[PDB]
Design a protein around this nucleic acid. Structure first.
Lengths: 103, 35, 147, 180, 185, 128, 201
RNA sequence: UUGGAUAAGGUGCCUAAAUAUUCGCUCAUGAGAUCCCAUAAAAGGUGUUGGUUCAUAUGAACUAGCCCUGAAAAUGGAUGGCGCUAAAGCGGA
RNA sequence: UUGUUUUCACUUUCUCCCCGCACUAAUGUGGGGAAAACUGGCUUUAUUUCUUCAAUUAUUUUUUUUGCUGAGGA
């Protein structure tokens, strides 16, 4: 009906990480229908929006977005690394991101 | 390059034949020492 | 020495549990690796786990060794010789039109329509949406006339 | 070509010879076929056997030739009998094993996998002597004998090995191992 | 690992056989037997008009191949038990104390007394499709008969083992009920 | 003989091989740094120009990175001077990784150390 | 992973593989509901797994068994404990992941009327060679002290009968819809019919 | 500090990465599972898998892989845990 | 005390014949023989966009989509 989406859904997994060590400059993101490195390479360079709600208004709006970008793939199973303007908080692990169709 | 191919075939054939003759000599020696 | 009339029905109704053997000339579909999704023919068997599959110069699979676990055997099989080569395999494939009769079975049509559906452009995706919309309009009309 | 499928064993023909000294004007030259991952390893093996069999070490020797042997018909399956010498944890044993495939190097790779699997024999414990193509009438191992029937056919009881893309986590109905 | 190995069993005359996904039903004039072989990887072919059953195994290792003959013998046992009932003849031997056998509930539930003069009743219940009766010719005999060899032989074993001797020399105190012979009717 | 015997005692901790011309050229062109300054005050500088090559090695007519490449590839009359003038290459880790630095390249198992012969070229290319 | 909730029919799955897949899904944030937990399979014989559970039962804090490892005998709880062992349950995020999981024996009222999914990489039929032994979790639980196996079985047969009635109605409706569609396919314009025929509709 | 790529070591979950590919072996009613490292022997097995040498497809005798016995301790307990057997074990690639 | 030379033994059949003559895993089969020559192998000519032109190495030249960075101020 209304509110076209034209973006691919993704989920914020943890940070770029080893066992017992974190690199919260990158975020691991899982994209909806991608399960392979070759397919994940497709959405490289696309902008990513972490859109989330907030208890009280900040510009007359209850919603704000953390902007980032897909930088490269991660592993073999279509997980990507995203670099955001600011490190997304670990409270957002498991939340939804938009892999936008632009650029 | 037909002549080069023929010469090449001949050298590889000689190498394979030498290997096979080693096979036969070792088998003959083993059969000698069986008895 | 012959079988009269018992054979022509009993052999046919035998209904073996295992059809689709790994004989030469069995038409199989590759499902793993760089040639996944392409058809090929088993030309002969090297070990229990290894076979030689040759897609005649049609299917795009070269003559090569593949492990048998990477194959999915299909219903079709041609009568190629034990040691036949690529040229005679192509001749026999064309003569038998086995590939045509594969692109008629339920799997072959499914593969064909899936290929063209994933090849569809944005305009023809909309054309499908529009056509299904019209079909739904008509379906509702006759469903209500049914009542 | 599928690199997931290829192994990295090749056959090399290596010819070497001791450096001519004032004692002997020209030593006899030796030639050998060695299966190895690359020509460097093949030459290392060649000098190992030179030193072990003859009293000739790499420092007193020189390499006259080293070239890779390519199988004539890499798409024709043949039966290979390979003689073998390997030392187990408590002794040394020579055995004879049989394979069938398209290339001698492929047969040797099968041999290495099988010796490791069956006898825990590492490649450093194996010496390959005498791999050679054999005739069907002289095949001796039953697991190869049963592969040479007039018409050979069997079902395809292997489980399907799909691509990663279609190896989906949640299925809508239980698949069939019968498939066929 | 052998590529294919098969064994063939002949179907006797008055037997009807139905095999579906290695579940076997054998019907004959002495009743119907059932047996599921779904614990074995077996390709079972039943030829109905030309009789015979062939069990085939593809890619069998010796451990699994040992079961082909087992299945074939089980099938032939079903055939014979359905054509002519299996019969285990048992003798109750005793030294000084005679063994009193009483058969009740329609030739099941045999109860014995006076085992070593114990004046305590030991009873065994026959397995399904099994009847226990006294022989009409020789007195210390017992007939355990039925269509299923497993059930019949197990009933004979139960009768034998319900009457074992305790805290004595077993090789001198020999009294008990023992399977004298195996046959059919 | 002298350098081979020196290399023998260090063999388990290095891997070496015969470079070939294209890899020599790639090494000098993209990872070639040079010791520029006074003697014992060298100040590593990327080549970027033939001026410093001319200044230090010109008296042996080695004006130019192509002269450097030639003398290195063909062990020519001026090799010690060119090699010493050239700062030690600082290579990246290999693109696909090693196999096992613990074991010899000539061991039947995967390994890396020892003389790789011509196989040094692909490793250098991954490390460059 | 991207659904609001995934209902998994645990019948015929292997316990450890099922638990691993469920654990990863929960940590990634997917709510899953596991039904028919009494039909989970474990590789290895029933006696061997019973010995394993006896070893587990012999385990308790000897100063106060109330504090000890609570053993739990319902097969649903056994699955839940396995998933928790595959999980970082002592962190806040791990606890959230654990509490995103619901386990049932049988198929209760909401979940009997929703689509049940299956994990191919955890079916016994795909992960165990046929000639090897396995056990049924409900049977193990009954031998260990659950004594609700038969009740769940009869509830399941009643549910299956209801489901069969539903399926018959659904099949009839599908046939009716198919007939209406095939009649309507001749009433649309030939361009629309041609597009649908070309793309397989 | 920002990117990149690796080492050692890993890639079923805990835990970032393979329920990867390919070939064998193993069923354990106390399986096994990363140098140091967190014990196991003599002696056995008609378990199974390959080899060797004698006997007109048979019988033996050896050999060595994995498995089993030998193998008993005190709070309740530890391949790190869960668990894993078409391995997530063992030997390779 | 090396070469060189020679013998048979090596193939497909959806062929024929015999025996079991329906016995097979089989829409066939086991055992024993005959056959040419489709299949397979070799030689001559023309062609390589019907089809093939591979793999490795040496030596070169490009290309798709993209991440991070912008010191300095002559």
């Amino acid at each position: 009906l209304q509110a076209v989406r034209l973006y691919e859904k993704g989920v914020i997994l943890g940070y770029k990480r080893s066992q017992r060590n974190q690199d919260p400059n990158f975020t691991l993101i899982s994209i909806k229908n991608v399960n392979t490195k070759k397919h994940a390479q497709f959405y490289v360079g696309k902008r990513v929006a972490y859109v989330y709600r907030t208890t009280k208004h900040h510009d007359g709006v209850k919603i704000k977005c953390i902007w980032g970008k897909v930088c490269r793939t991660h592993g073999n199973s279509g997980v990507i690394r995203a670099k955001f303007k600011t490190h997304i908080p670990p409270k957002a692990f498991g939340d939804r991101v938009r892999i936008l169709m632009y650029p | 390059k037909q002549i080069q191919k023929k010469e090449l075939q001949k050298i590889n054939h000689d190498y394979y034949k030498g290997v096979a003759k080693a096979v036969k000599k070792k088998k003959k020696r083993e059969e000698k020492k069986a008895k | 020495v012959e079988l009269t009339e018992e054979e022509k029905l009993y052999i046919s109704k035998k209904n073996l549990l295992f059809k689709r053997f790994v004989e030469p000339g069995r038409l199989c579909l590759i499902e793993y690796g760089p040639y996944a999704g392409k058809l090929c023919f088993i030309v002969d068997i090297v070990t229990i786990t290894r076979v030689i599959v040759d897609g005649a110069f049609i299917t795009g699979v070269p003559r090569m060794v593949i492990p048998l676990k990477r194959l999915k055997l299909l219903k079709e099989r041609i009568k190629i010789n034990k040691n036949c080569k690529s040229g005679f395999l192509r001749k026999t494939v064309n003569s038998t039109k086995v590939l045509e009769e594969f692109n008629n079975s339920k799997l072959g049509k499914k593969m064909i329509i899936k290929k063209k559906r994933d090849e569809a452009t944005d305009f023809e995706r909309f054309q499908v949406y529009f056509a299904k919309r019209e079909l739904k309009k008509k379906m509702t009309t006759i469903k209500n006339k049914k009542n | 070509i599928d690199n997931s499928l290829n192994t990295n064993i090749h056959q090399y023909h290596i010819v070497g010879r001791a450096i001519p000294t004032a004692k002997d004007k020209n030593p006899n030259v030796y030639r050998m076929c060695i299966f190895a991952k690359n020509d460097t390893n093949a030459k290392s093996r060649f000098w190992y056997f030179m030193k072990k069999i003859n009293k000739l070490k790499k420092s007193n020797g020189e390499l006259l030739a080293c070239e890779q042997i390519k199988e004539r018909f890499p798409l024709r399956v043949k039966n290979y009998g390979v003689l073998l010498r390997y030392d187990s944890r408590t002794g040394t044993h020579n055995m004879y094993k049989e394979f069938r495939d398209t290339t001698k190097e492929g047969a040797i790779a099968q041999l290495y996998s099988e010796m490791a699997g069956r006898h825990r024999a590492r490649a450093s414990s194996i010496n390959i002597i005498r791999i050679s193509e054999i005739s069907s009438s002289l095949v001796r191992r039953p697991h190869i004998k049963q592969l040479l029937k007039r018409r050979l056919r069997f079902p395809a009881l292997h489980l399907p090995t799909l691509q990663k893309e279609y190896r989906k986590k949640f299925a809508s109905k239980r698949p069939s191992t019968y498939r066929m | 690992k052998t590529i294919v190995s098969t064994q063939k069993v002949l179907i006797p005359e008055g037997v009807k056989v139905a095999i579906n996904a290695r579940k076997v039903t054998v019907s004959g004039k002495y009743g119907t037997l059932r047996r599921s072989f779904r614990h074995l990887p077996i390709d079972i072919r039943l030829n109905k008009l030309k009789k015979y059953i062939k069990v085939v195994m593809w890619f069998g290792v010796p451990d699994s191949l040992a079961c082909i003959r087992t299945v074939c013998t089980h099938l032939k046992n079903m055939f014979t038990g359905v054509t002519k009932k299996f019969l285990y003849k048992m003798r109750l031997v005793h030294a000084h104390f005679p063994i009193n056998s009483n058969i009740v509930d329609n030739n099941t539930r045999i109860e014995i007394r006076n085992y070593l003069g114990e004046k305590s009743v030991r009873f065994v219940k026959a397995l399904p499709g099994v009847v226990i009766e006294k022989s009409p010719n020789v007195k210390d005999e017992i007939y355990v008969s039925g269509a299923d060899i497993e059930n019949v032989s197990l009933t004979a074993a139960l009768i034998h083992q319900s009457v074992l001797c305790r805290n004595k020399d077993i090789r001198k105190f020999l009294d008990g009920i023992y399977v004298s012979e195996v046959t059919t009717v | 003989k002298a350098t081979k015997e020196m290399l023998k005692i260090v063999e388990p901790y290095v891997t070496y091989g015969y470079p070939t011309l294209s890899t020599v050229r790639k090494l000098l062109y993209k990872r070639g740094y040079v010791r520029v300054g006074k003697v014992r005050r060298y100040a590593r500088k990327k080549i970027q120009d033939n001026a410093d090559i001319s200044k230090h090695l010109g008296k042996y007519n080695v004006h130019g990175i192509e002269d450097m490449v030639y003398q290195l590839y063909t062990c020519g009359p001026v090799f010690k001077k060119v090699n010493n003038f050239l700062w030690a290459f600082k290579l990246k880790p290999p693109r696909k990784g090693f196999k096992a630095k613990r074991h010899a390249f000539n061991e039947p198992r995967p390994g890396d150390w020892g003389n790789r012969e011509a196989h040094i070229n692909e490793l250098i290319n991954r490390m460059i | 992973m991207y659904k609001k909730e995934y209902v998994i029919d645990c019948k015929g799955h292997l316990l450890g593989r099922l638990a691993s897949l469920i654990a990863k899904e929960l940590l990634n944030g997917q709510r899953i509901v596991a039904v028919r937990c009494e039909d989970i399979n474990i590789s290895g014989s029933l006696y061997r797994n019973k010995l394993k559970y006896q070893e587990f039962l012999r385990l308790r804090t000897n100063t106060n068994p109330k504090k000890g490892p609570l053993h739990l005998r319902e097969p649903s709880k056994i699955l839940w404990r396995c998933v928790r062992g595959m999980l970082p349950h002592k962190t806040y995020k791990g606890q959230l992941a654990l509490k995103k999981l619901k386990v049932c024996v049988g198929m209760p009222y909401p979940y009997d009327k929703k689509k049940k999914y299956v994990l191919p990489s955890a079916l016994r039929a795909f992960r165990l060679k046929k000639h090897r032994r396995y056990c049924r979790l409900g049977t193990l639980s009954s031998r260990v002290g659950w004594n609700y196996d038969t009740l769940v079985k009869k509830n399941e047969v009643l549910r299956k009968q209801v489901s069969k009635a539903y399926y018959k109605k659904k099949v009839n409706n599908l046939n009716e819809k198919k007939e209406i569609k095939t009649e309507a396919l001749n009433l649309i314009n030939p361009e629309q019919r041609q597009v649908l025929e070309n793309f397989g509709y």
